[PDB]
Amino acid sequence: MWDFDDMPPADEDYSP
Amino acid sequence: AKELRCQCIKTYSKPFHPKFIKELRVIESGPHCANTEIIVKLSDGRELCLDPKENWVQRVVEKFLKRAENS
Amino acid sequence: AKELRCQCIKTYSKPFHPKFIKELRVIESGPHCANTEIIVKLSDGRELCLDPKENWVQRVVEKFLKRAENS
């Protein structure tokens, strides 16, 4: 259970 | 030849981290974009678009290159 | 989980100019490759693989970044 010391998207309209 | 949008529809200002990046993608001004856009595959399982206009982007991205090169 | 080949099995043994490069692609060691491979895409709609082991590759590729950034 390794911690992710941050983060990634909290929205989504980025699909090239 | 009528209307073409850039590959990066938008960018996202949240300071991300290289830990999540496994694949990098850079597309220079094309017949759809008259500029430059940094793109990146997110480990979540999708794509994401960064803005080279942010300093943290030049850093997390720089580390990816230094990491994939040292590997 | 049996057998996976790297995204790039061969490379290009002929130095060229970024003038033909419009899109860059870099994939770090993945579940299929335990190293690093710098892929690229030519405007002609083609895709090849370069070997970072060659100095001319670090140059033509470096120019692409300096060109897409200055753009």
PDB file of C-alpha atoms in Angstrom:
ATOM      1  CA  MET A   1       0.000   0.000   0.000  1.00  0.00           C
ATOM      2  CA  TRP A   2       2.417   2.650  -1.327  1.00  0.00           C
ATOM      3  CA  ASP A   3       1.310   6.293  -0.957  1.00  0.00           C
ATOM      4  CA  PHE A   4       1.062   8.589  -3.997  1.00  0.00           C
ATOM      5  CA  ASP A   5       2.833  11.753  -2.792  1.00  0.00           C
ATOM      6  CA  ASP A   6       1.149  14.194  -5.208  1.00  0.00           C
ATOM      7  CA  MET A   7      -2.806  15.084  -8.914  1.00  0.00           C
ATOM      8  CA  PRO A   8      -4.394  13.503 -12.097  1.00  0.00           C
ATOM      9  CA  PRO A   9      -7.647  14.838 -13.687  1.00  0.00           C
ATOM     10  CA  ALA A  10     -10.747  15.836 -11.677  1.00  0.00           C
ATOM     11  CA  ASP A  11     -12.522  16.610 -15.018  1.00  0.00           C
ATOM     12  CA  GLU A  12     -12.492  14.885 -18.438  1.00  0.00           C
ATOM     13  CA  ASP A  13     -12.545  16.498 -21.896  1.00  0.00           C
ATOM     14  CA  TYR A  14      -8.943  15.746 -22.986  1.00  0.00           C
ATOM     15  CA  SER A  15      -8.984  12.871 -25.526  1.00  0.00           C
ATOM     16  CA  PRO A  16      -6.880  13.733 -28.643  1.00  0.00           C
TER      17      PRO A  16
ATOM     18  CA  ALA B   1     -10.129  21.559 -45.931  1.00  0.00           C
ATOM     19  CA  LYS B   2     -12.849  23.403 -43.986  1.00  0.00           C
ATOM     20  CA  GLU B   3     -12.421  23.344 -40.197  1.00  0.00           C
ATOM     21  CA  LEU B   4      -9.849  21.439 -38.113  1.00  0.00           C
ATOM     22  CA  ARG B   5      -9.355  21.642 -34.339  1.00  0.00           C
ATOM     23  CA  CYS B   6      -6.041  21.205 -32.514  1.00  0.00           C
ATOM     24  CA  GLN B   7      -5.266  17.725 -31.076  1.00  0.00           C
ATOM     25  CA  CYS B   8      -5.383  19.108 -27.525  1.00  0.00           C
ATOM     26  CA  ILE B   9      -9.016  20.267 -27.332  1.00  0.00           C
ATOM     27  CA  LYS B  10      -7.897  21.805 -24.011  1.00  0.00           C
ATOM     28  CA  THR B  11      -5.121  21.508 -21.402  1.00  0.00           C
ATOM     29  CA  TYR B  12      -5.317  20.984 -17.608  1.00  0.00           C
ATOM     30  CA  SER B  13      -3.357  23.229 -15.203  1.00  0.00           C
ATOM     31  CA  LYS B  14      -3.204  20.726 -12.261  1.00  0.00           C
ATOM     32  CA  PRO B  15       0.507  20.038 -11.430  1.00  0.00           C
ATOM     33  CA  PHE B  16       0.755  16.324 -12.354  1.00  0.00           C
ATOM     34  CA  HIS B  17       3.673  13.972 -11.575  1.00  0.00           C
ATOM     35  CA  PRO B  18       5.992  11.742 -13.693  1.00  0.00           C
ATOM     36  CA  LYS B  19       5.074   8.679 -11.540  1.00  0.00           C
ATOM     37  CA  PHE B  20       1.827   8.336 -13.567  1.00  0.00           C
ATOM     38  CA  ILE B  21       3.442   8.868 -17.045  1.00  0.00           C
ATOM     39  CA  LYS B  22       4.526   5.877 -19.132  1.00  0.00           C
ATOM     40  CA  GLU B  23       4.239   7.295 -22.662  1.00  0.00           C
ATOM     41  CA  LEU B  24       4.928  10.824 -23.951  1.00  0.00           C
ATOM     42  CA  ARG B  25       3.519  12.388 -27.131  1.00  0.00           C
ATOM     43  CA  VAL B  26       4.472  15.720 -28.742  1.00  0.00           C
ATOM     44  CA  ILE B  27       2.687  17.063 -31.841  1.00  0.00           C
ATOM     45  CA  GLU B  28       4.054  20.162 -33.587  1.00  0.00           C
ATOM     46  CA  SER B  29       1.821  22.668 -35.412  1.00  0.00           C
ATOM     47  CA  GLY B  30      -0.119  20.625 -37.988  1.00  0.00           C
ATOM     48  CA  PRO B  31      -2.853  21.198 -40.585  1.00  0.00           C
ATOM     49  CA  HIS B  32      -5.146  21.273 -37.546  1.00  0.00           C
ATOM     50  CA  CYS B  33      -2.978  23.247 -35.117  1.00  0.00           C
ATOM     51  CA  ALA B  34      -0.742  26.253 -35.814  1.00  0.00           C
ATOM     52  CA  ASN B  35       1.176  25.791 -32.547  1.00  0.00           C
ATOM     53  CA  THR B  36       2.702  23.064 -30.385  1.00  0.00           C
ATOM     54  CA  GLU B  37       0.998  20.687 -27.933  1.00  0.00           C
ATOM     55  CA  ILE B  38       2.395  18.250 -25.349  1.00  0.00           C
ATOM     56  CA  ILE B  39       0.262  15.114 -24.850  1.00  0.00           C
ATOM     57  CA  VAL B  40       0.784  12.238 -22.390  1.00  0.00           C
ATOM     58  CA  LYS B  41      -0.645   8.770 -21.691  1.00  0.00           C
ATOM     59  CA  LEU B  42      -2.025   8.616 -18.127  1.00  0.00           C
ATOM     60  CA  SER B  43      -1.518   5.309 -16.216  1.00  0.00           C
ATOM     61  CA  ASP B  44      -5.248   5.485 -15.252  1.00  0.00           C
ATOM     62  CA  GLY B  45      -5.799   4.285 -18.845  1.00  0.00           C
ATOM     63  CA  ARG B  46      -6.406   7.346 -21.049  1.00  0.00           C
ATOM     64  CA  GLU B  47      -4.688  10.396 -22.624  1.00  0.00           C
ATOM     65  CA  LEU B  48      -4.064  13.863 -21.109  1.00  0.00           C
ATOM     66  CA  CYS B  49      -2.871  17.224 -22.583  1.00  0.00           C
ATOM     67  CA  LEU B  50      -0.299  19.519 -20.860  1.00  0.00           C
ATOM     68  CA  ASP B  51       0.411  23.213 -21.447  1.00  0.00           C
ATOM     69  CA  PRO B  52       4.158  23.959 -22.033  1.00  0.00           C
ATOM     70  CA  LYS B  53       3.169  27.398 -20.763  1.00  0.00           C
ATOM     71  CA  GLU B  54       3.449  26.079 -17.187  1.00  0.00           C
ATOM     72  CA  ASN B  55       6.835  25.647 -15.502  1.00  0.00           C
ATOM     73  CA  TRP B  56       5.776  22.491 -13.638  1.00  0.00           C
ATOM     74  CA  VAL B  57       5.016  20.957 -17.035  1.00  0.00           C
ATOM     75  CA  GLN B  58       8.537  21.520 -18.299  1.00  0.00           C
ATOM     76  CA  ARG B  59       9.739  19.832 -15.105  1.00  0.00           C
ATOM     77  CA  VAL B  60       7.580  16.708 -14.766  1.00  0.00           C
ATOM     78  CA  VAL B  61       8.090  16.231 -18.505  1.00  0.00           C
ATOM     79  CA  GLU B  62      11.842  16.839 -18.255  1.00  0.00           C
ATOM     80  CA  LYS B  63      12.085  14.152 -15.583  1.00  0.00           C
ATOM     81  CA  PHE B  64      10.291  11.661 -17.837  1.00  0.00           C
ATOM     82  CA  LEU B  65      12.976  12.162 -20.492  1.00  0.00           C
ATOM     83  CA  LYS B  66      15.806  11.928 -17.951  1.00  0.00           C
ATOM     84  CA  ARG B  67      14.150   8.807 -16.524  1.00  0.00           C
ATOM     85  CA  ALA B  68      13.435   7.053 -19.831  1.00  0.00           C
ATOM     86  CA  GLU B  69      16.980   7.911 -20.928  1.00  0.00           C
ATOM     87  CA  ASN B  70      18.725   6.696 -17.768  1.00  0.00           C
ATOM     88  CA  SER B  71      16.669   3.492 -17.900  1.00  0.00           C
TER      89      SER B  71
ATOM     90  CA  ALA C   1       1.220 -12.625 -19.307  1.00  0.00           C
ATOM     91  CA  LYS C   2       3.254 -14.940 -21.566  1.00  0.00           C
ATOM     92  CA  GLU C   3       5.341 -13.159 -24.213  1.00  0.00           C
ATOM     93  CA  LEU C   4       5.411  -9.443 -25.098  1.00  0.00           C
ATOM     94  CA  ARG C   5       7.715  -7.729 -27.604  1.00  0.00           C
ATOM     95  CA  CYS C   6       8.988  -4.149 -27.348  1.00  0.00           C
ATOM     96  CA  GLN C   7       7.065  -1.515 -29.316  1.00  0.00           C
ATOM     97  CA  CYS C   8      10.236  -1.076 -31.400  1.00  0.00           C
ATOM     98  CA  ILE C   9      12.083  -4.204 -32.549  1.00  0.00           C
ATOM     99  CA  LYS C  10      14.204  -2.491 -35.225  1.00  0.00           C
ATOM    100  CA  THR C  11      15.592   1.038 -35.684  1.00  0.00           C
ATOM    101  CA  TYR C  12      16.536   3.484 -38.455  1.00  0.00           C
ATOM    102  CA  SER C  13      20.183   3.377 -39.581  1.00  0.00           C
ATOM    103  CA  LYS C  14      19.877   6.499 -41.749  1.00  0.00           C
ATOM    104  CA  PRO C  15      20.166  10.011 -40.156  1.00  0.00           C
ATOM    105  CA  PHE C  16      17.586  12.531 -41.403  1.00  0.00           C
ATOM    106  CA  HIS C  17      16.204  16.020 -40.669  1.00  0.00           C
ATOM    107  CA  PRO C  18      13.226  16.865 -38.342  1.00  0.00           C
ATOM    108  CA  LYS C  19      11.787  18.553 -41.457  1.00  0.00           C
ATOM    109  CA  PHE C  20      10.107  15.198 -42.111  1.00  0.00           C
ATOM    110  CA  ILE C  21       9.108  14.769 -38.460  1.00  0.00           C
ATOM    111  CA  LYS C  22       5.742  16.196 -37.409  1.00  0.00           C
ATOM    112  CA  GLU C  23       4.934  14.027 -34.376  1.00  0.00           C
ATOM    113  CA  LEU C  24       7.257  12.565 -31.720  1.00  0.00           C
ATOM    114  CA  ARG C  25       6.543   9.546 -29.504  1.00  0.00           C
ATOM    115  CA  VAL C  26       8.582   8.261 -26.536  1.00  0.00           C
ATOM    116  CA  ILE C  27       7.657   5.061 -24.666  1.00  0.00           C
ATOM    117  CA  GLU C  28       9.514   4.169 -21.459  1.00  0.00           C
ATOM    118  CA  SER C  29      10.141   0.564 -20.362  1.00  0.00           C
ATOM    119  CA  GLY C  30       6.697  -1.080 -20.226  1.00  0.00           C
ATOM    120  CA  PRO C  31       5.233  -4.531 -19.534  1.00  0.00           C
ATOM    121  CA  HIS C  32       6.495  -5.313 -23.040  1.00  0.00           C
ATOM    122  CA  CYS C  33       9.844  -3.505 -22.967  1.00  0.00           C
ATOM    123  CA  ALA C  34      12.361  -3.256 -20.117  1.00  0.00           C
ATOM    124  CA  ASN C  35      14.124  -0.271 -21.715  1.00  0.00           C
ATOM    125  CA  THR C  36      13.358   2.978 -23.532  1.00  0.00           C
ATOM    126  CA  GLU C  37      12.409   3.537 -27.186  1.00  0.00           C
ATOM    127  CA  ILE C  38      11.960   6.840 -29.033  1.00  0.00           C
ATOM    128  CA  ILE C  39       9.288   6.437 -31.719  1.00  0.00           C
ATOM    129  CA  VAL C  40       8.454   9.100 -34.308  1.00  0.00           C
ATOM    130  CA  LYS C  41       5.862   9.862 -37.024  1.00  0.00           C
ATOM    131  CA  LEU C  42       6.531  11.399 -40.451  1.00  0.00           C
ATOM    132  CA  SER C  43       4.057  13.792 -42.106  1.00  0.00           C
ATOM    133  CA  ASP C  44       3.742  11.250 -44.934  1.00  0.00           C
ATOM    134  CA  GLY C  45       1.691   9.308 -42.388  1.00  0.00           C
ATOM    135  CA  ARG C  46       4.457   6.808 -41.571  1.00  0.00           C
ATOM    136  CA  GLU C  47       5.935   5.636 -38.258  1.00  0.00           C
ATOM    137  CA  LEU C  48       9.509   4.495 -37.563  1.00  0.00           C
ATOM    138  CA  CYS C  49      11.765   3.861 -34.555  1.00  0.00           C
ATOM    139  CA  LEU C  50      15.029   5.615 -33.658  1.00  0.00           C
ATOM    140  CA  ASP C  51      17.873   4.353 -31.459  1.00  0.00           C
ATOM    141  CA  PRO C  52      18.893   6.873 -28.714  1.00  0.00           C
ATOM    142  CA  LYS C  53      22.202   5.024 -28.932  1.00  0.00           C
ATOM    143  CA  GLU C  54      23.114   7.159 -31.969  1.00  0.00           C
ATOM    144  CA  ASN C  55      24.330  10.744 -31.566  1.00  0.00           C
ATOM    145  CA  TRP C  56      22.551  11.957 -34.716  1.00  0.00           C
ATOM    146  CA  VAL C  57      19.310  10.750 -33.135  1.00  0.00           C
ATOM    147  CA  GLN C  58      19.768  12.913 -30.064  1.00  0.00           C
ATOM    148  CA  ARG C  59      20.350  15.822 -32.450  1.00  0.00           C
ATOM    149  CA  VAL C  60      17.558  15.555 -35.031  1.00  0.00           C
ATOM    150  CA  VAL C  61      15.243  14.795 -32.113  1.00  0.00           C
ATOM    151  CA  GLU C  62      16.603  17.689 -30.044  1.00  0.00           C
ATOM    152  CA  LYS C  63      15.899  20.061 -32.925  1.00  0.00           C
ATOM    153  CA  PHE C  64      12.294  18.850 -33.119  1.00  0.00           C
ATOM    154  CA  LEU C  65      11.787  19.843 -29.476  1.00  0.00           C
ATOM    155  CA  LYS C  66      13.521  23.204 -29.947  1.00  0.00           C
ATOM    156  CA  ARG C  67      11.419  23.749 -33.078  1.00  0.00           C
ATOM    157  CA  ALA C  68       8.056  22.709 -31.621  1.00  0.00           C
ATOM    158  CA  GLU C  69       8.850  24.826 -28.556  1.00  0.00           C
ATOM    159  CA  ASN C  70       9.905  27.959 -30.445  1.00  0.00           C
ATOM    160  CA  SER C  71       6.812  27.636 -32.648  1.00  0.00           C
TER     161      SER C  71
END
